[PDB]
């Protein structure tokens, strides 16, 4: 089971996206664990993720998080997918980042 961690200083809004992603992962039997955390834990919690996703509000922090976790694929969630709360779409982008990372 791969760990997909989402980071944003506003878990409440990201938390809703996480619940929809979990529903989708169950529907299609994707072996993943999805958790939302505030941006302050990106360095502490990110070390255990298989893929690190940043909320669109914290996109400006991408370079810093990449330097903090040089051995993890880190990327920003598409703002439209995020605003629309597209659990399936974001789940797809996360699995993709993992595949593109393992090869």
């Amino acid at each position: 089971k791969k760990h997909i961690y989402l980071f944003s200083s506003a878990g409440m809004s990201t938390s809703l996206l996480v619940s929809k992603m979990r529903a989708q992962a169950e529907k299609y039997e994707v072996p993943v664990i999805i958790e939302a955390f505030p941006e302050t834990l990106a360095g502490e919690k990110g070390q255990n993720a298989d893929v690190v996703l940043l909320g669109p509000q914290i996109a400006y922090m991408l370079p810093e998080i990449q330097r903090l976790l040089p051995n993890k694929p880190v990327e920003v969630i598409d703002s439209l997918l995020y605003g629309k709360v597209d659990g399936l779409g974001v789940l797809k982008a996360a699995v993709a980042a993992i595949k593109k990372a393992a090869a």
Binding site: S9, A10, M12, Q57, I58
Partner: protein, 103 residues
């Protein structure tokens, strides 16, 4: 909701950045850099002011599907803003003390 929810995320992030700047301002003071501390507090204040202004609008036109009821996220947004504003004010006092400590 759409904007209100995305707006709250922005407010939470803004409030978080404000605190971050405030703590950073304090750190400057510890280094004996009163000039940088002062500049950081000013920017932090401005950030809060803009955030507070947005919240003011969010309280004057309080949503809420039901009669008296209001947007739930309002209180959440207020929580972050109130905490950040208070923190900064106290931090400002702390910085002034550092100045009095001579250092």
């Amino acid at each position: 909701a759409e904007e209100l929810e995305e707006v709250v995320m922005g407010l939470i992030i803004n409030s978080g950045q404000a605190r971050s700047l405030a703590y950073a301002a304090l750190k400057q003071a510890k280094q004996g850099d009163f000039a940088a501390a002062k500049a950081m507090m000013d920017q932090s204040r401005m950030a809060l002011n803009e955030a507070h202004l947005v919240q003011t609008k969010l309280i004057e036109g309080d949503a809420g599907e039901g009669k008296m009821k209001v947007s739930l996220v309002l209180v959440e947004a207020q929580l972050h803003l109130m905490t950040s504003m208070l923190a900064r004010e106290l931090i400002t006092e702390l910085i002034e003390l550092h100045e009095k400590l001579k250092a």
